[PDB]
Structures are given as C-alpha cells and as structure tokens.
Amino acid sequence: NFKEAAKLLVDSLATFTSIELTSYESIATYASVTGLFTLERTDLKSKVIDSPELLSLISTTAALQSISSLTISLYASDYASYFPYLLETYANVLIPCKYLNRHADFFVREMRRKVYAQLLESYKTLSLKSMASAFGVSVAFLDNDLGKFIPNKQLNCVIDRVNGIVETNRPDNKNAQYHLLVKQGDGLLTKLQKYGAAVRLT
Amino acid sequence: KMLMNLHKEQWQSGLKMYDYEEKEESNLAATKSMVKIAEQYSKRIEEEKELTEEELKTRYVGRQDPKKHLSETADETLENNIVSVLTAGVNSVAIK
Amino acid sequence: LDLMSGILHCEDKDYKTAFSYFFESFESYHNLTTHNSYEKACQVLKYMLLSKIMLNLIDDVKNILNAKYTKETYQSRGIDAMKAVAEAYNNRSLLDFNTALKQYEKELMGDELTRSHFNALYDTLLESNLCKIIEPFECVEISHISKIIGLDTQQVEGKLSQMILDKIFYGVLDQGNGWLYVYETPNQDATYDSALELVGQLNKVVDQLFEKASVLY
Amino acid sequence: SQESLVKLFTTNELMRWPIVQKTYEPVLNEDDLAFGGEANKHHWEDLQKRVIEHNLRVISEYYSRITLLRLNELLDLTESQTETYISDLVNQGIIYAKVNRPAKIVNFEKPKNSSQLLNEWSHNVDELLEHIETIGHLITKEEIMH
C-alpha cells in the first residue's frame, strides 16, 4: 500500500523526531520511492520542488543519489539517462532496505509502465527505432518490454510492426469515463443482489 | 370546460420543449446534490442500532429523514429524464 | 542586506520588489570608498538590468543604461550582455538569445542569478513563441514550424513533449509523417464525472447497510 | 466615385486586387493623400493586404471547409503568402481557422460545442409547431370566403 505511505511520508520530511526511527538520510530515500511510484508527472513534480528538505540535503549516500537522479530525468523528459538510473536504484535502494526488498521486482515493473505512460501521452505516434534511441537501448530490446505490459492493458497502445510505428488508442474522452463507471455499477448490482437474496430467504 | 381550459398548450406542450442546455443543468445539479444527501446518510447509518428512533434523529441528525430526502430527489429527476428523452425521440422520428 | 533581499525576491518570481532593493544596493557600493567595493558595484548594476527583462519591460532596461554615468562608472562584458539579451526578448528571436550567451558566457558563470533567470526567460519566450505559431493550425508540419521559430528540428520536438504534459495547449505529436495535431477541444464531461462520485458513495453505503443486516442473521 | 469605393466593402462580395488596381488608378491618382508620391505609394501598397483581408472574411462566412490549394488561386497569391495573411487575421480576432499543411483543407469556423448545436435544433422544433398552427387558423378563414 504505497498510496497511504506517500501521504504520510511527505510530512515526515518537514518535521522529524528521531527516537526509534531509522536515520534521516534513509527517511528521504523512502519519500522519493513512494512519490515516483504513486504520483504522476504534475503532482510528483510540484512535490520535489516544494520540498526544501530534499534539496538542501543534496546527495549524501549512494541510495539517495540513485533515487534523486531518477526523479529529475522523469519529469524533465530526458530518457537517455532515465534508464542508467533505473539499474542504479535496483542495486542500492531496494536490496539494502528491509521493507522494499520484497518489492524489488515489483518496483522495476511498475516504473517502466509510468515512464512509458507519460511518453505515450505526449505523442500520437512514435517509431520504434526513435523510441529505442531515446532510451539508449537497441531496436529488438524495446519490443520485449512493451509486449509484457500490453495484454494486461495498462499501457493502452498497440504496435504496427510492418509500419514500425507504435499507435496510442488510450481514450481520455467520454469513452474513457464510460469504461470506469459501468464497471462500478455492475459491482453495485452484484452487492445488492446477494445481500438481497440472503434477507428475503431468512 | 371554460374553467378547465387555461392553455393553448394542450397539444403544444409535449412536442414543445426546453433547450438541452437546461436539461444538462438539471442533470448536473441533480447528480451533484445527491452526493451530499448520500454523505449525510453515511454519517447517519453508522448508527441506527442504539436505543429509541427519536433520540437518534436528534443527535446524529435523522431529522426530515435523509433516507426519505434522497428518495424524493432521485424520484423527481428520474421521472423528468424519461420525459426528456421521451419527447426528444418522439420529435426526431415523427417530424423527419 | 540589500543585495540578498533583491536576489531572494527574483527566485520568488516577483521582480518589482527585487528591483527596488537593488536600486539602493548600487548606491551603497558606489558611495562607499572603492578598493574592491567597485567590483561588487558592477554586479548589482547587472542585477538591476536582469529584473526589468523578467517584468517584460525592455525599453526600461535600456533607460537605466546611459553613457552619462551608468556605463562609464561600471563597464563589463556583462553590461554589453544585458542589453543584447534585452533586444533578443523584444525581437522575439531565440537565435539572437543564444548568440548573446556564447560570447557573454562569463556573466552566467560568474553570477548565479544571471544564469538562473536566463534559463527561465529562455523557456517562457520559447513557450509563448510556439503557441502563436501553431495557433491557426492543426496538422502543421514541424518542418514548417522550425523555419519560422529559428530553432532546429529536434529542438521543436523536445520542447513540445513537456508542454503536452503541462496540457497547456493539449494536442498530440505524430512522428509518422511529422505533424503536430493541435486539439483545443473541451475535456471531460462534468455531468458524467460527478456520476462517478455518486456511484462511489452508493458503493460505500451498501457495505454499511450490510452491517444492519447482521442484526437479521 | 466615392460612393462606389465604399459600396464594395460594406456588402460582402468576392473581388481581386488587379481589378481594384486597374480601375482606381487613373481616377484617384488625381487626388492626393494615400496615392502618388514616394511614401504615399506605401499607403496605396497597404490596400493590397486589406483587399486580401476582405476576401478572407467573405470566404470565412460562406465556406467552412475550402481547400488551401483553391484558396491560393482565389486570393491571387502563392501558398506561403496565403498562410501569412490567414495568421495575422486570426491573431487580431477577426476570423478563426485551422490550416492543415498537407494542403487538404483550411477550415474557417470555431468548432461548436454539443450544447450549441442542439440548442438550435430545439429552436427549429418550436417554430415548426407554430407554423402548423397559424396555417390552421387561416384555413378556417378561407372556408367562409369560398
């Protein structure tokens, strides 16, 4: 549950009591993890410019450095250097921490989705080769990664292979709202159906 | 009959209608408010398991019945939209 | 005190309050006995000149500078820098800007303030320029935009990505042909959207009604 | 001569620049201010843009989709120049458009909301019901006359 963490941990930065709590450089590293994972471009961005505490501390341990680097690249739209930082976070942030070593693999998985989401937002189309050069990874390397996310359907794009383009058919209109709503409304029916039936019979 | 008749809107009131702007306003107001009646009903029904109905109504604001108030607000807009569609489609199909 | 107070409000993005504190800071150095206080006085003059560019008042940058006593007392490569960038902002040329910063780099290097607000000024001059260009378009080739703006091809594309993320003109960028579609259509149905919170509340309530029905069981 | 000069612009019509140019040159080069000279030929020069701007307004109202390739022919301009005139005219707030660079369409219109199109459809229905009424009362009248 990193959503709950994210709201609690921003407060932790502003004011800190140190008794029975792990060293403060560690507390900054936990805040940056939750912010990147949970929040999207805009909220995330405003959060790490309006936190003086993170900025006055700069880098001071390897784990903090790898996390902070990732951050800048992500909202600033540099994808060349986004990818070394991904590898770096893995080694020095998740594995050493007790509470994120369970999430080692979960973390890399979700983070590739977000980066891609923001890119897809800004483009109608990309060419696979252009999208690969942006990362700094070869042509074949990219196709695998996209293809693990796409049938699960939280990337909401498709790839014309013959055209070499990647198309983005993610709705943000009225059609998108429709998908959300009707799914919840089936859930209301179902909840009433069962609890209904149980009370009529008894 | 003279008394009863007070309209030239006896046959000119079902095909006649108000712009769809005004129907968008009714739809938007109605949905927005029913959230607020629904939030009072949620505070309310954390109870409904103590002693005496009459007490609960005072203390945790069962007054006017929020259960009754939500039914009324839903019934009024629900019946109104069936009419709004019903007249809408009637015009499209008969006139052209 | 005066120098810092000026520099503090420049970062807070009001340059009206910044400029007044620098007006008094210039006078203190000037009228104090020179012996090294002359080097610092030059720096404040530039800081007077930077402020009026952010405020979007580029003849008044021009007005403070005069060959009567303003250039004559304090003369640097940065005094020449100040008015070249002020003319770049007026022209609305991003070319004129980069040309200034190449030969006047040492002002950016020696003063942090100047570097800071030359980045902010660059991007917003850019942002505003681009919006005008693409305003009576939709399916405008990026090749055509790039002529008129004066930047490189690559540079247009990179700049647009961030803006679409701001949502500050919306639109989607197509590299399958090189167009930019500029969609300025309304987003999100308000009526449909408030229906999500109403269902949301009905989905919560029914768990609570089921708490009542534990009585019957 | 004066009555006819204003009479073009007050109404909406299509016209071209070497028509204006040929006709009004032996006439109004006899009168000064805006004509002759070495700096007032630059005030004459200025009427070429306004003739072009006047066409853009007429075309805006009547076409909502016209080809950009056809627009160039109309104005007597090349494609670049046509673009510049449309840009500056949207900027002042006198027209509105979106130009498609593949050259398929230049579309003059500010796109309409759903609510706008539908509010007009209500207005038609109320007026059709009114027309049938009034006819019905004038039919009753004619039965006595005949």
Side-chain angles (χ1 to χ4, degrees), chain B residues 14-75:
Chain B
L15 290 162
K16 290 188 189 182
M17 52 183 193
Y18 326 92
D19 310 75
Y20 282 96
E21 189 192 297
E22 302 284 274
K23 300 183 168 188
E24 283 179 306
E25 283 283 302
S26 301
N27 289 26
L28 185 60
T31 298
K32 276 170 164 67
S33 283
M34 283 164 74
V35 184
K36 318 180 174 77
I37 306 154
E39 278 187 287
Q40 176 54 226
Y41 188 48
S42 193
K43 178 178 83 62
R44 192 180 177 267
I45 56 199
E46 291 202 312
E47 320 305 322
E48 319 301 286
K49 58 192 51 61
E50 298 183 294
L51 295 174
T52 305
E53 264 307 305
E54 181 69 88
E55 315 183 312
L56 284 147
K57 302 199 283 174
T58 306
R59 313 158 297 166
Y60 293 98
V61 175
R63 307 296 313 173
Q64 306 193 60
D65 289 54
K67 185 166 71 161
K68 192 34 184 186
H69 186 280
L70 208 153
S71 306
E72 291 181 19
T73 61
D75 185 37

Side-chain angles (χ1 to χ4, degrees), chain C residues 102-170:
Chain C
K102 54 187 49 183
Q103 68 185 109
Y104 298 140
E105 189 58 58
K106 297 155 286 296
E107 190 188 44
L108 295 61
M109 282 167 74
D111 291 35
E112 170 181 68
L113 191 66
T114 70
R115 184 175 290 254
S116 198
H117 295 301
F118 282 175
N119 301 331
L121 197 58
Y122 186 76
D123 175 58
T124 53
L125 173 49
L126 219 162
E127 185 273 296
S128 299
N129 276 9
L130 194 51
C131 165
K132 198 171 271 272
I133 292 165
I134 59 136
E135 176 178 290
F137 274 109
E138 182 175 289
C139 195
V140 57
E141 285 184 335
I142 62 157
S143 294
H144 186 49
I145 299 158
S146 67
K147 315 187 165 58
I148 295 275
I149 205 162
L151 290 178
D152 302 346
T153 305
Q154 307 298 97
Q155 178 78 251
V156 167
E157 292 161 42
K159 298 306 306 200
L160 284 161
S161 292
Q162 282 181 59
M163 294 169 190
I164 296 173
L165 295 176
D166 300 292
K167 314 281 170 73
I168 203 153
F169 67 86
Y170 307 73

